[PDB]
């Protein structure tokens, strides 16, 4: 599966994931590609901020889905 | 950050926000907790009705601040 | 709603109000536009001097109404 | 040399290997002991998924090392 991520600055990043991947596995791939600490990642989908424990399937995230990544601190 | 909201009927509601949260993010949390449409929310602070575009920091709203929520239609 | 205000000197001022606005909310908008202390405002409508506590609807003030503003001290 | 393998279900399996053994020789011993098709084996060490072509020495896997075996499909 592939999914996409958009940032508050307009930039998109592609990621290869699996329907079983947890949310903490998703930002941790984001830590491999862009270097952002996972603790400093907010991932937003269909109006809910994702929780590290659940999975992509849990949140009904399929192929071609676009998440939102807000950074905080 | 936490802030508070008082109503013309004497009831207070607690909200967890951030100094970067916009005013439209604030009533939209109020739409999650009490069900009121945001378009039907007036938020009043230090004598000014808040504007959806600005932020809590913009209006100098810190931790422990109390807003006022007037409903119209 | 819009209403109008005339002065003993012939000058008119427009105000945007609501049928629920009290009389003390009306002069206080007048304190924002012209700087006159509200305690120094008399508002006259259909032969009665308005009371701070009542409302525009209470006095049957509709859209397009013209009030009279007498200043005292 | 001996190395160990842990599964997402908590079970460990011992294997006898050599520092020259490739990763495809390692899952293929796993196909002899537990019957899992090698194509259906993920082998994870020090944060990297191993590649069939490289060797145990290539990935700095010594005696007493513990790998991780994730099954997919």
Q: What is the 3-state secondary structure (H, E, C) of chain B?
A: CEEEEEECCCCEEEEECCCCCEHHHHHHHHHHHCCCCHHHCEEEECCEECCCCCECCCCCCCCCCEEEEECCC
Answer whether D14's CB lies under 8 Å from D32's CB. Answer: no
Chains that touch C (3 or more CB pairs under 8 A): none
> Which of D28, D29, D37, D26 is CA-nearest to residue D72?
D37
CA distance A66 to C48: 64
Q: Which residues of D15-33 are buried (b: 16+ CB within 10 A; e: fewer)?
A: bebeeebbbebbbebbeee
From residue A33, alpha-carbon distances to A14, A28, A29, A41 in Å are 10, 9, 6, 13
DSSP assigned state of D40: G
CA distance D52 to D42: 10
> Which of A64, A65, A29 is CA-nearest to residue A46?
A65
Structure tokens at D53: 């072509």
CA distance D25 to D55: 9
C-beta atoms surrounding C21 within 10 Å: 19
| CA torsion through residues B9, B10, B16, B20, sign | positive
Chains that touch B (3 or more CB pairs under 8 A): none
| HSE of B70, CA atoms in CB hemisphere, 13 A | 11
DSSP assigned state of C67: E
Chains that touch A (3 or more CB pairs under 8 A): none
Bridge partners (DSSP) listed for residue B62: none
C-beta atoms surrounding B56 within 10 Å: 23
C-beta atoms surrounding A21 within 10 Å: 19
Phi, psi of D13 (to 5 degrees): -130, 135
Bridge partners (DSSP) listed for residue C11: none
Number of structural domains, chain B? 1
Chains that touch D (3 or more CB pairs under 8 A): none
Burial-class residue D46 by CB neighbours within 10 Å (0-12, 13-18, 19+): exposed
DSSP assigned state of D69: E
Query: CB neighbours of C58 closer than 8 A, spacing ≥ 6?
Result: none
Strands B12-16 and A42-45: unpaired
Structure tokens at C49: 């001097």
| CA torsion through residues D51, D57, D60, D63, sign | positive
From residue D63, alpha-carbon distances to D9, D44, D59 in Å are 23, 16, 13
Largest distance between two CA atoms of chain A:
30
Helices and strands: H and E segment counts in chain A: 1, 5
Range of the domain at B47: 1-73
SS3 D33: helix
CA distance B30 to B20: 17
* Separation of CA A69 from chain center: 7
């Amino acid at each position: 599966m592939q999914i996409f991520v958009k940032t508050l600055t307009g930039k998109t990043i592609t990621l290869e994931v699996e329907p079983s991947d947890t949310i903490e596995n998703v930002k941790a791939k984001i830590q491999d590609k862009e270097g952002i600490p996972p603790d400093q990642q907010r991932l937003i989908f269909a109006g809910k901020q994702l929780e590290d424990g659940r999975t992509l399937s849990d949140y009904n995230i399929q192929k071609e889905s676009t998440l939102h990544l807000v950074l905080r601190l």
